[PDB]
Design a protein around this nucleic acid. Sequence first.
RNA 1: ACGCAUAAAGAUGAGACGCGUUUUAGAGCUAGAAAUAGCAAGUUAAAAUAAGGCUAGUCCGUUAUCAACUUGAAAAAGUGGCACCGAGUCGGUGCUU
DNA 2: CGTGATTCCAGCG
DNA 3: TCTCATCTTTATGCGA
DNA 4: TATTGGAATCACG
Length: 1345
Amino acid sequence: DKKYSIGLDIGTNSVGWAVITDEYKVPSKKFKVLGNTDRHSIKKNLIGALLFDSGETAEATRLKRTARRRYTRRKNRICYLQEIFSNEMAKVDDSFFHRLEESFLVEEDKKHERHPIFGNIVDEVAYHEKYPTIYHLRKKLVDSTDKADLRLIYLALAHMIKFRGHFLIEGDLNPDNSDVDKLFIQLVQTYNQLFEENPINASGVDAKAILSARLSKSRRLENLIAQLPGEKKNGLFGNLIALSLGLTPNFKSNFDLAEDAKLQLSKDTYDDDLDNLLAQIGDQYADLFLAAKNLSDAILLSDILRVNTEITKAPLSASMIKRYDEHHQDLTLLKALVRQQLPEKYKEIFFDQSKNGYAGYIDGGASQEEFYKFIKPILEKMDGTEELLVKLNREDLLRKQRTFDNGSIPHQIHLGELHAILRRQEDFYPFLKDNREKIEKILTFRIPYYVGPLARGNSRFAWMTRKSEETITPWNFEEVVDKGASAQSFIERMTNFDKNLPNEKVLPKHSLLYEYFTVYNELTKVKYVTEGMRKPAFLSGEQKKAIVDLLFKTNRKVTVKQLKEDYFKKIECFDSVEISGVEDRFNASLGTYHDLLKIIKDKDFLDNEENEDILEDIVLTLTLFEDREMIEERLKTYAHLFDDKVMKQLKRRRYTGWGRLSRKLINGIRDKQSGKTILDFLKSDGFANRNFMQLIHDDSLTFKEDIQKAQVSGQGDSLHEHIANLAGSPAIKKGILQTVKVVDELVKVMGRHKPENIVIEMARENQTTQKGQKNSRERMKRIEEGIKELGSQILKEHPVENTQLQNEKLYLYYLQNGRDMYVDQELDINRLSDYDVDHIVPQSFLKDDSIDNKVLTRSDKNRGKSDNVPSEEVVKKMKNYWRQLLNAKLITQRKFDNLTKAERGGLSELDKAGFIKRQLVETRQITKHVAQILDSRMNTKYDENDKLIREVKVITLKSKLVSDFRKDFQFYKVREINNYHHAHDAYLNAVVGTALIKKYPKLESEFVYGDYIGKATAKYFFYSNIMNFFKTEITIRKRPLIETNGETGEIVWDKGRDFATVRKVLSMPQVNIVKKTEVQTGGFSKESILPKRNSDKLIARKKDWDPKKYGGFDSPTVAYSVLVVAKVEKGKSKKLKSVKELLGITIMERSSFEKNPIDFLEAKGYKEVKKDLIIKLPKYSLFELENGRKRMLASAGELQKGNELALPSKYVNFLYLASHYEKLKGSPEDNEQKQLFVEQHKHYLDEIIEQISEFSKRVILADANLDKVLSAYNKHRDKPIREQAENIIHLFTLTNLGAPAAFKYFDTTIDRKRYTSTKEVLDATLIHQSITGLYETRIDLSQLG
RNA sequence: ACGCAUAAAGAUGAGACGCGUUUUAGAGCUAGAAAUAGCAAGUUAAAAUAAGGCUAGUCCGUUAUCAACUUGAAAAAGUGGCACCGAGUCGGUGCUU
DNA sequence: CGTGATTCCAGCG
DNA sequence: TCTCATCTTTATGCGA
DNA sequence: TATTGGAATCACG
Ligand SMILES: [Mg+2]
Ligand SMILES: [Mg+2]
Ligand SMILES: [Mg+2]
Ligand SMILES: [Mg+2]
């Protein structure tokens, strides 16, 4: 019958809980201990923390699942090709495909000859000599005309199909449009054919070198214009050249068409704009544009390949052959030079695989970059290596055909090569002639992103709808899959429902109705004051309509200046007026109205409200679909209203994004006694002038009743089901469920009585208006100021709008002044999606995708950077540019440090020593959901008028309040001492929340969940000053010792005892720390495929691949260990010996074991096991052995420390002060006093060490490490107090709970002492802990046997 | 608690690239009895890329769930007095059952 | 000849 | 690494 | 608001 409160400190990887009473005292209770041990009752305090492994996001699972799908579909492509070829291959060589399938097997396991292709040694050797690589074969098949062996044709086609390339570029890059000079000559001839007055003569100009140079587009244009005698860059030929290279030219000046008619070949609107231009003049110039298109295709081909393609139809194969030949020549030259000049290193370079030489480059794991790093000093220290050095600096020395940078090759190249092979060989083999389209489709077919997995209802990820029930081959995908329905479901399965009407779907963000709702909602709360008016008055419905018609429907954005002058000064004839409710510009805007008015050029069509449904359907279609086919098909129904050009313009426009409200809410429902929708009320509410929130929360209005009727959907769900149904990442579910479970356990412990208050520490914050606005400035402002300070002209070259900067690649392009950050080059603005957003710190090392860890760079450069920080060479080359950007504030100091990390060593392990920025977001949303769940679950009873009775007030305390409470009353928190700080944080949150809701009841609306100089500054100052009643001496002001309730008589705070009570609570030794036992799930083992070795720790990669001959995985992950007491066979006679041991069922064996434990154990060797004496021990199972020493089971063969060091609060405060945590943030008097306190308490350090020492003599039992730490401490006694305190904070890692870790005390480094022996725990006391740790069951394992 | 505008950090799903690794194939030669030594060669390909499963799909297989005990196919339900004095991981005293 | 100390490693753009 | 899409939390600013 | 287990190798009483 004693009232109590529960304080919670939630985190991503920890949940601290505390129970307090009226006097802020944590109760102590006797809990019964179940089990067979003699211990039966234990006294425990109602405070503690729950520790669990962080909930992982589904990112890795999704990536692996997508990889699995891609592998399955690649094998299916190869299977389709084999099915096509099988009929003729059986005539040629029946077992060829069988040999290809079984090539992996060892000689004896093979059912055929070991040679896969030809089946005999001589032919295989001859083939390998004639075609050293596959690319030689591809080049030969493309170029040769004689009949080729069908096996070679299949090999080439299978190589092309298996590795087809990227699909980033749309359309078809005709390989025959390869020559640049010939197409340029054709363009010149076509230009001169109709323009004989001033013919263009470009003879003797090396067009290929000039246009296909590595310089920038503008530089190449200028070079070509200069080489053109008497031609103009802005001329018609100049504009055609600019279009061909990539620049978007203005054709208005060339023909004086009075319209710009800008033509960018990259844009898909190029064709329609060209049709417009033809309508301006005629089709006589069309051949010129066709020649320009061909020249552009040739230029792009040369850029992506950079090879002489004038003699072959397979430019990629020719490039690879040239690369192979140059590799061979350079290798021979390097061998000769090493033999002549540095013979003793020859064996190191060409034989030692362990090194990074050529032997390590080919046979070893050394990459191209590492090989260049190793070989450059040797190359420079020699003679006759000029060409080798030039190649090395160009990254074209001893290259491989299959490298990292092949990812920039479009699939059109392989498509053209495959088409050439088929055309060459179709006459000899008729089945190639009649199956050309089949194989080309196999190469080019790719499931649309909106269709997803092609399941038959057995997949939780599939959404496609099948028109006909049939197997989906790539050749009938168009006839079996309902693409329109699939795309509609793809969009709709992700978009959320309206909160007020959960059955309805939200409107598109750019929908006309949504924009009208936003504009009217913002406008209806505007007050105007003119001379002669006593008070501000709301805008009337007539005035609001006039404003909308005059200002919003004409100007894209309406500023207060226009409203004050265009309307009030002119229409209303008001000389002066003051406007309140809008700061500078109306946030809402009729953007869609202006876009559609420009598209259709019909004011009356949009103004009329009869066709409002038509516009809503138009915007819905433009939002749902992106493919022009589906959009055109949907808009066909409305084609009669508009015209053909208007229809094409509508097709071009594509909105994206969805709003937060439905159409049934904005304009669907109506008031019973008014017959006006919410939008109708917003347009003209009369003198009341209510807005949306007042409308749906008005009792006189009937909208609230309808919302209540529609919101009865959610009832009768279990807690697990409720958590699972929550939208968001599955990472936060673990934390939310654990918090709710510990709250329920605490309620159960206190005799089923609900807590009076539940105070939760929440990551909210309050900032001053200046700081808040300066961190919320639009990125356009940042890039504008950076460009202005940098002195660049990129903004004038390519003007941008703040909306367009939402695209990450464009934003990074502008942030980097348009130039690459890893090489001294210039990025192409139009041709994005060829560069990569590289994480400066590799994504495999640390999870950080902030703007301070992203750089837009060349794809090949990024991929060569690989799993590393940018190399020292890149840092040296680009440090000046990085500093220039840093001075212009285009990049932050953190980004500069990330870029120049290579100078300060490499990726040290300590770099992974800070909190991830993802953890803060996870904590925020975990706390939000926890508050919602607790408020909904605790308060269930409703009043007579259906009003919830707040029996359990949920308070959301901001972390700053508790942090200041700690920093003001010497309750300092040191995170490294132990895990008690979570429980202490929870207790302090409870205390502060209870005190604040006691002394200041009027603050309940601001702290209790439910009801609720700029405003931010006012709230910041208010929150800072609220906690002043805790202070004894303000600033000097001495408030009374015992704080009164205020307007009532209560003891809200008593500084004489309450501080003492809190100090006593924070120094309690017994705090219930629980490590949640988790069954390990995830990958079966390490993904690395180890080579063949005679070891039984290897796991076979297939059931028929014995690891003694094929290698395989190792290091399996143990799902949970199993305590088994049984009999094993010992000796040759195999006598039965009784043994008790842990087995460690791995993840891969978990299903087999759980299906039949006895048979599995007997297979493992143990005999006469007991199905009842088998004990399932998950990871982190707790065993108490002796002297209170606790070990947590980490696996079948390793233990973790399971004890917490209860350091007294005085030592913790001394460590916090001496270490200068957060430097010194006190007044000079207080800083001097604290420094004197530290100096007078030097001896504490010794005592602190003693503590740790004695702890390590009782629990840790690490003799060598403890002796090393003592020796280091004795060595560093003469150091200053600050360094010693910091290094002792480091030293506390020895006695922390969890897996042992290695630490550093000054210079000395102490490695981790691992307890790789689980023999002891077999004769210890296993402890099953409830989620709060209060309820325990102790099992004496020594009694088992 | 919510709607807009701006921003920062994140999340979820789909379609695709490029590598990497494993085993085999690409007859290594000579001197050697061998141990080995000298020389030549090196760039490519096939297959696998969680074992695997039944629902046989161009599907699914690494997120989420999980203290012990009792009842249960599961879902889920149930199981553990209090007060006070103290405190090195909780101990003691009284009451009560 | 088991056992404690030590070293090395971990699929990725 | 690329392409496409949809969500969340938090901060500031207007309005209840 | 955080954070290592598997495996091999070697000294050595
Ligand atoms: Mg916290
Ligand atoms: Mg498979
Ligand atoms: Mg990268
Ligand atoms: Mg905490």
